[model samples]
Target chain A: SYAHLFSPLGLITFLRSAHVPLNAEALKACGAKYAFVGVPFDEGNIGKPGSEDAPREFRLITQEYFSYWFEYNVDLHGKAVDCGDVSMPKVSPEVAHERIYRAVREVLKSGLIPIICGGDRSISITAARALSDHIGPQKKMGYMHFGAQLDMADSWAGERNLAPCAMARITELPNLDIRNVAHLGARNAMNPKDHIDLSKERGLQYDSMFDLFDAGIYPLVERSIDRVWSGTDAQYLGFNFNVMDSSTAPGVTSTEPGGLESREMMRIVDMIAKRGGVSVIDLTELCPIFDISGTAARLAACVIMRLMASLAAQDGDVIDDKLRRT
Target chain B: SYAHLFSPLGLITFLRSAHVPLNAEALKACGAKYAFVGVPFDEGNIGKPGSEDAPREFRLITQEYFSYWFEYNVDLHGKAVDCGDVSMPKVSPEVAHERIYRAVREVLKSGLIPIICGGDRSISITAARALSDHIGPQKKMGYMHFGAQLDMADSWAGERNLAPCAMARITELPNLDIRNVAHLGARNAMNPKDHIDLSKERGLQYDSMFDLFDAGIYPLVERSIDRVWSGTDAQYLGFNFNVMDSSTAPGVTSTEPGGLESREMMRIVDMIAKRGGVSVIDLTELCPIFDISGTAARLAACVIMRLMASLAAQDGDVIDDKLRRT
Candidate 1:
């Protein structure tokens, strides 16, 4: 046994789970249904640059929670395994994307859903591509994104695969149909004219905060879930955290007002989880250094755990309500 | 014109308003309806010690907001005068309490409601007393508190006026009736047996988070508001942001999960504002150092501003919706 690989009580692994190497054999040997991979690469970001610390802080906040979720009656013990961070290459977005893509693909090959925590929104571009390629050209892949900005730029400062260009690149996947793609929670002036132009030109169904408020979060998100999951072999659920209101998620790379509240987001995620499950989950742009009381990270962790619990409940994997903890 | 008294464009005063002295004459001369007083005292807190910096950070976050609130359609510009912070005495709770009491009394004497930003929960003890004394013994005064802990400790280590003893000291005011007193959002083991014992002995009404969830926030808070404002000439509304879920308010001295969400709290405050208004309003135990992305301070500021806007709307002080900023 490599003692150094084992996380102590003081140190944290994702959801406080056992660590497994990013190899398909190791993941299969451990019988993990979910693989948590950290992509600590912020090279793709165009805005605030502190989200590289997100994966670490994201894990650190999970220490505050227990494995049991009372609402769903699900115990998360041994349900998932931490695969550690994709070793990032300094100043090399190309190499970073390669590592992230390979890691997610490896997890997919092992027959485990990848729960990816990211350095910025751009990680979703590579991870989504991984999911698309894994499903192959014969099958359909669906993608859904949540953020305050559309992030549909074809290129940012000549960089084709940066955070702003995430959706632009993701939509171009051979297996991803435009009808199965849904983008929610876009608002403010940060959404450039080109981003909107590209989204409209590509026939992407993107809803602004005003539309959300008018239709109500539940019904709007319900319809989105229906569209994203319809006739798709695999789905990638992406979050930028900035989709949350500035008051609710202040630690993101960009905080926007008039967005989803914590309760609203929780309800939306629970709804998403109710539709069977997602193929891949990625949360990005969580800037922990700016987070007050580590609440943002705690919230991010809670959201992921909630999704897991909801999935477990849907699959009838809950514990007996009468069973007491000893 | 006192040039230095005017806050510069870069500097922030409370709600970005003109600074007024704590003297009643100055407040009266300004024709202000509300007086904003900051109490930068933290000696009363036993758990965390950084709340003394709350008033400064609290002011700073207000710079991000504007004078107009769309939901209420009311402008806060020129409605309130900032009294700055009550000059705190070093390491002396007695002097701190004295200064806080006098400052609030001066504001009350000026025929304006005192919107007090506190040093700790204990600051409420002095502020409540000021309101009680202002109303006199013949007139009935009411008190309502929101926090995670019961805070009914008779004394903590023989310190009578500390944060833990806030409710204990407040309930002892001659004019405050037990029927008119209410405490909401109590949970966890932080509340000792003695606190509950005292609450029962005094016949005080306290509701835990379990009770709130079961009955729903609106119905329970509606009933509490009725009881607190019933036949009372003056009411003191106190908030320890710890009443919010830790994920909602991480900047407080203590963070408790499963408390009120932001939307829930906002609705409660709006309901409270609907029942006319209160004599004194105080928010305590905001430790800005722990706050992520300054969201807590912003939330606190928004809550106060919401109350003001609601009051204005109730009195028909809103502007024409078609009016342009230019």
Candidate 2:
């Protein structure tokens, strides 16, 4: 009967980590440094639907990877705990956002970084607020976003918390400094003129793909990393996979051409990881239905796993150099 | 009435190009340098099914991309023509492979490089043969395979031309010298002991993922390209997306971890393109249903398009430097 344990088929969790409830007591008892929370809330998404299935597919793709990462010489096992998914009420966007905020807030309160897999980009509005409130008004928070659209609409169709208004709402946080806010990989016609106008008016640091290419991905990423990590009590790292080129990542809610390649994105994540760690991490707008080969979810997992490995390596948790997979 | 032409919706074709029938007369009439043919044959696949749908999804994702490639400054619009799918018969592997061979042969005979997309890796067996015979027994032929498995099995469950025996069959070509054949990205458990033995017994040059990391990707790719293109009159470039890391290409049948990244693969393709062009290009084992967000197909299209762009740029088909997309 024990042979079943060695079988390839097993209950899949996020990175095969233990599943812990999204509560302070449970998270604390788990003794995990990070909490993996799934926010299956897509009602606020204005683009394509089906990102609600992202959490499920995201977990499914993790089954294909081992905890061991060769590049970082780090094992991801026991580093993070999955907190299942934030239950979403049908046709209730406000409730979903509230639950997401509460879940992230609990994880932060328990002294664990939250790895948030989201239903859409709008979830960032609440997750960012959770991190902002967690750090308190006296402390400054740094915000970094990787996405294709400017997402600076004051409100979309009178909805303030829609996906398109993510940055607008986040920038309004009392404890978040404009100096610490940086958005990378914004490009294409998805961003309306109004979004750019709002971005300029707010003095937000928005780097388009053309700008990224002109400055080179590494230099611009380094500069952005410096700005986001400088003199901040906490940092919120948000990723809308649409920030990747359409060819690089087609499984997002909005697929845009001429964005970051997977390698470029990985390098960017590595640079961020070199800064030690981030307070909150959110990946959004993964539409599994449109994904040609589950590559989007796999890429999302790879970024998170890579970040974890880099962090582990930075913390000197690497395995023995002599150890080899036999 | 002509305004419909400006709409985003249109009949989907490979690279949004004209659809030419898979016949020598039609292909010749198209006056295209490359023929994009779809081998929708999956009966020869020994792994997971569903790759039969790859051709449809591959064409579908092409709708999202433009013919213009900014990096090479090449417009792909008139460079290639779609010859549609080689019709597959239900449950007939022999007939399927035969149709695939005939289709690729037609494109090759029409003086067009065949850009073949396939249902499974075994399609390479037939497509490579088509290239081999087209070059005739008097001339030398080269082969380069990008896949995670050696696929050198003489037969899979007594099936000689199954996906697992692609390399076994390919190396059997009369004009394909062992020195001019290279298999890159072999790694993990999918490659059986027999496959390695066969590769060594035949003096086949195989560079595993470990070997690649040791030598650096660029140098290894350059060396492999040298081996593949050195004294060969014709070449076959076969890509089984599974050669990509599970995270990089999860839409492939039998996705293997720890393989080439998209960027690395693109570089390899670019290096190959720098040689001018190959006689046959077949991308296989793309299971579109398993693909998350169509990224696999998109990546496949990207590789082919990038290769074409590189070729165009090399051939001096570049647009005016002053011209810009408004």
Candidate 3:
């Protein structure tokens, strides 16, 4: 909500308000279709230490633009609002997750789509639980996760809520369909057999880089969209930057070189939004300190802008893509 | 100036009163000669990742300034200020480069000397090309580059604007003279033969780590200042983090052992700044994620502050280089 403090473009970083509580009355009046929420909670993250800076660093550099994208011939002034970050007490990880759940749950109840930037993969569990009642147990929420690892450990270091237990916890939730859930970019040399074995036991759907490459990125994007649309009441988009090729997104918690390239990623993110319109979008594991050239940060910014731009453009920013000329 | 938000010191971040604009008029009104401009544009870098986050990450941690250098004693509050970053349009890489060119040119036109932090080495080309006309073609600008590679390749992967082609692009401009340019700390093991051949053909001057080690860093620093001052109208100092040993600057795009240590680099950067008073200073290729303990970033901040402190001292902020206890 404090755009004047920073955000040169005024377009991308227009926060209508800040520090707004999860109170349903306040959220309804806010009237925001898209909400940018930050979770600078990285205590659950076992790998890199700086994804905690994602919310600030991402917004700090991302909005330093002047509205128009010459390539798309479209203005980037979208209808998204920034809600600052979830106020974490840092007392305990349990408290932090509960806070995230409360905040996200309220946003969902207000009929607003939440665009969440995360601390790590564990935020996925909170997101799933928060959105469960909205989708209903009978009609499940479709899950689409983009990541280099499964993140499906039953438990880690005697803790069940760490990042590695994301998919494990997510599958146990009654309102989400484990079969409909898919991991788009899975290739981890560090992955243990138990993780993949657990995912397989649940009859999970996933595509490695090799599978995606062989099947073609465009087609996979099409199938993922169709599968999500036909399978569930709503879809949740879990984007771990590690799903991207490390060369393009080296600032992530994990580095995997053989994954989706940025341009292809932009296309897929946009394509997913076009069909089902992701009700919840969470991008996790962007460690600003680990990033090179702000490559991961810019890529993340582009992903958000491209999705928001596509949504806005459909609201009449561009028509025939060629004839407007204006 | 706003270091309380992030940095440890109340120093360096003092944007509390620093001027920030890409406009020449506002910049001239601000009246600061040495300017810290963040150019986190990295579309041109074709090597190891994370330079795009350099401008932010470097500043994010750099200023834990307790001000006891133990080597040099000078108060660092100076006439130099931070002008923020150049706004980039995510159109084509060509468009991005051109936008950088325009913003930097305006800063140059305003008579504000710029010390730019960048996404990659390609920014040096833009800085040089932008300042070339301002300095006048009749009087050349001497260039001193600190890096682990020649960065003078003709092209890479059919791309003309990649980091390796930086010097090639700068030297080709009519306003820039090649003979006055020098590359310091170059010791790339896998650097192609053609790269050296191209540099030699242009009568380029360079001193590798071995050369500087044998000659003693202090004399070379003195000689560089003398050469730049005598041979050109103004000077451009390019500090690539790879010039420092890998142990000291592991976060750079490339790492080489036996390079200048951080202390030597700090000494050299300050030495040159004290004499020639560089018209433009650009530091490139720092990956914060790769850095250990944020040492490289802090070193960069010290270099800038040391130069600013020297300038402030010259402007009578301090009575003498030594014996200034209070």
Candidate 4:
């Protein structure tokens, strides 16, 4: 189902386009490793407006500009498919979340990895819920976030599930372990005490940019991966582009001065994807209008491509190990 | 040296502003490993006009958003100093080139690595000339370019020094070695036979998107490094962001479809800087207006920071190795 959003644009670089009313039967038949579904609604965003433009901009860049082939002869062609943008009803955020949740659910049902590009971080609330609902209460899902803020705000400006409260809201989902959830790259003095308090109260784990600087990104990433992987059926990575240093992600809605370097962030994404069990990935908070040079969106595209490549290169051991670790 | 451009902008996140009329005297006293010089001129671009906005945007984002410190304890805080924008005569492109050449020459005289932000790729011509003149004909210089097209156009629309003919113009320089020059990531069918033929005729080496795709990026980069390093007293990297896959660098003046990934580009920059002898680096073709999400600008900032980090880590052995390789 498509809406008044930007056209599916031309097939996102080397990815094939999918027919509408996406279902599991045809997706499985397509045999692609991953399916991209665009959620272009930002009614949930209390920050700025243009994140809703991300999916379209991302698609245009991916289709018209981004390269699927790299120096290693790695071509994402045939490895991924685009399901196009999800049709939005212009309804409440709750309804939008339901639409997004179902869209992810459909992709998962087809046994394909769902790579989602979002309007904002608020979309992750539903993405996590969908992952939890997919694996059911018999198993568990883990949360991994790379962001500039704790996003642990109990409620921001009276809103319960906007960008700032993403982690706080996701914590309420069943079958997801609070201790298994991780928030990485949080910095910016703007964060108040309650965010940290909320994280501690929920027994959650996190590493600020300062902490990551001391602990080393790769080591912290490895540790976070294990902590989440140890008891989860699958994992959801809410990759807030703002997790990157403001210098590197100037296109985000709410930019903080310092964060992860692009190379470091990409390495973490690639490594985590390869270790396996990362099924759902939501790239959020990309506002092209704010971007002076498309740096943030391009980085987003780069990470999404890296994630797909990692998934494609995974061995059976990586896949099976994910289950065992859980 | 400042002009009517984007506001100096909030002290670039948190960095201190430098005194005007940037000079080697005060810059040396700053005790920084690198110096940033702005070249806000894009009149040489046949494609777009906004690249002149790059230096200011880069500074704004860098000062505010980019992290000076990373998880591994690497920080660029005091490691680099801002030399501010080069004072252009507001004259012709030829005059601009002369001005840029002297500016870079001045920075090098102080023994500080110069990090340049550009108006467009055309500026690289004077950069190469300046390096050649400074290093002397007694020893040769090596050239490395990462771009979408060969930039080997004999002349574009009757202009020999515009962005498209940058490599061609540099090849004519007396001190730079044609055989030692290497071009990576050239793609887009818009390149005519003359460009490819020129690259071959000059005895220059190059790898198109296809070649890089098959050879693997890391290995190719290492080999390319050694090839250029072995013959030159020093090296200069002209990193055109357009060399990136269009999806990743849509803000360039003339963007080709397929190009290097942002992660791949940054990795190369870091490696080259560490291998040393990379005396001059110009990040060009960043047109902020065309950039949908500031992806290109932020990526530019990331590369600059990474470059600074590499320079900071260098020792005497690294310097000697450059000449030794020759």
Candidate 5:
């Protein structure tokens, strides 16, 4: 029913009318085409574990964020739906990965992008694999991350696919080309001296806050977009809210100094929105329990909306050629 | 020796320069009238309270901040000296307070502004006392403080004047008119919500970061000038460096959110320079050990310069009486 459609046609922070729960059929009737599947597991957060509760935290954070900006523009016409939390195999990271892949494929078949939220970042690998599997690895786009950790644990018990090992898992796919990857906001504590060597060895085009502080964030974002936008036919933006400085956002599991500030985040979002070719966007490990009053969630929301707005507003001309600079 | 002043400027981010000794006489020969005295005490901080070494740390912070900048402008101009840390009281806060007060009096006799560094915010109380004693309490001006705490401990550790009780102590001076006081950039958690209340109750108008955040630092500085310029014959700007956001400054004993950012400090200092009422200025609570390569100290130096510039630049007629519209 159109009654189920909470789209008010303007921007507001919250949609008080959208509080009524909807069934799948009601959701579909309300123009709901896509569903957000949240992965709330972090069994493999290894180095400094205990993020298994990550998904629940991210969702709660998302909810609180929704509440705060509820007045700004809360309703998305009810077209976007919350599919709720995911059921994954015991940190058999692969089993969860497989399940996520299938669900994404199904969602895409339904004509909607699978907006995945993760427990730990590893879920990106699963989502990536599924996208690569369906679109063919060569056709699949690349990933851009703002994180402290590289997730390089591809080995055993010892080799668990925890938050730190997501990238390790992603590269294992022989068909996938890792040419279009960039990690922003890397820090010393997360990736120590030895880790720096590993990052260089893996050829990860990453820069810490120190690098960006001197270079300025906008130019850095522009450069990163330039680098990866060339390799992938499509673009994907993955944001780990820990990219912000610890003061504005100290609740992240891995909080640190010298992260991006609010204005920088908004600017980057606008850039992403203006640039088309972005096929997917996800914000992972947004544990509200670790966040300061939903700052992380709201920030993630700002990024997501900008991405969606960018995609929805995309025209043939906005998609600069793979080698084009904006 | 303005030609000899070409030492590189410093910043708190990188403390890479060799220790350059303060050449007070060279400045005196060049017609210097003010000197920077550091206290470096952290007695007032409750959370991560490390401002105790602030004076010492700020010197280092200054060393770093000026290291590179001085290379660009080297006359090493006037006699802005760095008097070493104060000798701590063997047992009492009052004795220590008087020691600083007397030292400042002697500096005042030399016709110097005597820019004192802090042990905590309380150092302002002593500085104010010395100024009032020299000029007579009735003629003593009000402190246009940037980030003074409002914790009302009347005795403050057996009647020793210190930060948590600085303003309160100032209020007790019979001849010291408490009417013209105004505290700015008041961020962080204030118990009972009356840290500002204490000021308000005493007819001290206070502005929090939000008040100034929208007004911009320049406007706030104008307002400060207006208050001090009109209310008293002389004025002081007690800048508690914690007024800076912890993100831009990680070393503060009080790195609370919602304060002015570091860049704004320079602007505030610059504004003070334009107002001329500044008779004495103090830079306090530096916490050198807690410092991160000295970013905090560099910021402190900018504050000192901005204020110094104010003494030479302020025009009393610049005050706009009607700017205070509710």
Candidate 6:
């Protein structure tokens, strides 16, 4: 029943308005390649307050400013859809993870790409678990990260399943190899050098903010595709929008200086079409409650549009093989 | 005589130190196709403070981070050099400009690029005059800009001869044609509805922040470069570092929101190497006191290096045109 009802959005562009997040049924009629769902809970959330509601606010921004078409040309609404958020579970994050796992389970059964917009970084655990179930455990799922902290703590600063420690948790997963994981733009005093060492120890293809910057974002994104796409049927990217500086995006619980800039971040997402077999895409750790003035939400939407545009271009045959190139 | 330098340290990146500024004599030995001069005299600076030190600080920053070696198997140096700042006359704006004109005139005649880093943008007007006097006026100089306002009163806060109003003055010169100018990142509020109308009527190619952000910096940079390199023997790029958003770069007199991030700006500069005959380059409007622990200064330095790296790479046999291609 799920496979019969959903399809991929053909393409998206600068001028295109983001399809509503809860409109999966409507998108199925249009032939969208993927369906979006929000799970705005931050198992990895590490700083201040308001790590949830990131998906809702993020989608609203995507709907607002990112509706124009320009340099890229794709109209993905050919069959796009929105599955809506999985209601928050009781106080336990394990329950929340289970809820997310089920929701993605449903999206995959429908044969559509599952995009998870999140409340915190810890949500990727659900995303990873869901991918293993859909694509089979024998296949690998790439863990592409944009933060320095590997969310490993069962609790941090007295909070359980916090977003900051989620990556540490990701490493514990058996199906997802640590070698497939990556970390970028990890700066500010909050990030420890040991975790970076741990990343290296794990054979993680890690490049810090300084290295990615000097090497160029275009190249970094390409290398990410190379590492994550190798020997995998479907790719999964865990994007922590907090990687942007506080001035450009202020609503997050954690902010860093000398991280990736907004345009560069968007460019990373824009190359999505070039990488094949994208199983899961998550934009995590957005707390819209703190952003009533609408800054972070707007940026979240921009991030969504960037990814969507890439997806759509892939459908439209407009994106080149530079992304696929090793 | 500043005619011939004994040493080419100014032209070579390795020879310069972080604290020092390159002098006129050193520029000669560097094989400068063009040389930059700063006339640090923005007596009109108000809101963003520290305009007077812009030229000196930029040179210091440029010298600090730039390396003659970059990319893979390439060493780029001595292609361009820095000349000292021009003398600013206290009595009359015309007299001060005359000194500027003469200085650039002699420099331009030598078949070398004459770059003018400024205390403010007004110095560009004299540089334009020199281009007109020697390059046969007729709007032959290739001009591209990144800024907040393009067509103001050519004055600051009701005072004449201010940086904001410099372009207005330059457009009126006999040989400098306004129509040849392509302005990117123009502010909507800085002008009334009438100003936008006037800009449209004048046939200006102005890409606002919204336009630029949507269009992507790389594409626009391509357009700007093609505009100059295609028609002119030498092109002049006067970058108002204020083209960057107030967050990462807040020290300029006229700060704007949603501007180019540092890396994007750097890409714009680096793209310059892809096109030949880039005669002059100036990094303008960085107010150090308003900076976040030298974030803006570091960016300015990085941008200069991106450009210089491109220029330096040109001398190498391995760095073909393929790197800059799509």
User: Once superposed on the true structure, which residue ranges of model 2 sit more than 4 Å away at CA?
Assistant: A1-12, A324-326, B1-47, B50-145, B148-219, B225-239, B244-251, B254-326
Worst 10 residues of 5 chain A by lDDT: A4-13
lDDT of 2: 0.82
Cα error, residue B284 of model 5, in Å, equals 1.9
Candidate 5 is graded, for docking, as incorrect
Report the poorest 10 consecutive residues by lDDT, candidate 5 chain B: B12-21
Q: Which ten residues in a row have the lowest lDDT in candidate 4 chain A?
A: A317-326
The positional error of residue A318 in candidate 1, measured at the CA in angstroms, is 3.2
Which TM-score does chain B of candidate 4 obtain?
0.87
Query: Among these predicted structures, which one has the highest DockQ?
Result: 2
Q: lDDT tens string, model 1, B158-205?
A: 668888888999999999999999899886435654566677789988
User: What ordering of candidates by DockQ runs from best to worst?
Assistant: 2, 1, 4, 6, 5, 3
lDDT of 4 by residue, B229-260 (tens): 78688888778877777666767777777677
Each prediction's DockQ against the real complex: 0.08, 0.09, 0.02, 0.04, 0.03, 0.04
Question: Alpha carbon lDDT of residue B143, candidate 5?
Answer: 68
Better of 4 and 5 by DockQ: 4
State the lDDT of candidate 2 residue by residue for A1-326, as single tens digits.
21111112115588778988888988888878888898888888888789989998998777666565545656676889898988879787778778888888899999999999879898999999999889898898999999989899998998798999999999999998788999999888888989988888889988888989999878988998899899998999989888887765778899888887665676677789899978988899999988755656767877788788788888898766543111
Q: Rate residue B58 of model 3 by lDDT.
A: 76
Worst lDDT 10-window in candidate 1 chain A = A1-10
Stretches off by above 4 angstroms in model 3 are A1-22, A69-78, A315-326, B1-326
Pick by DockQ: 5 or 6, better one: 6
Provide the lDDT at B229 for model 5.
62
Q: What fraction of the true interface does each of the listed models get right, in terms of native contacts kept? A: 0.09, 0.09, 0.00, 0.06, 0.03, 0.03
Model 1, residue A124: distance off in Å is 1.4
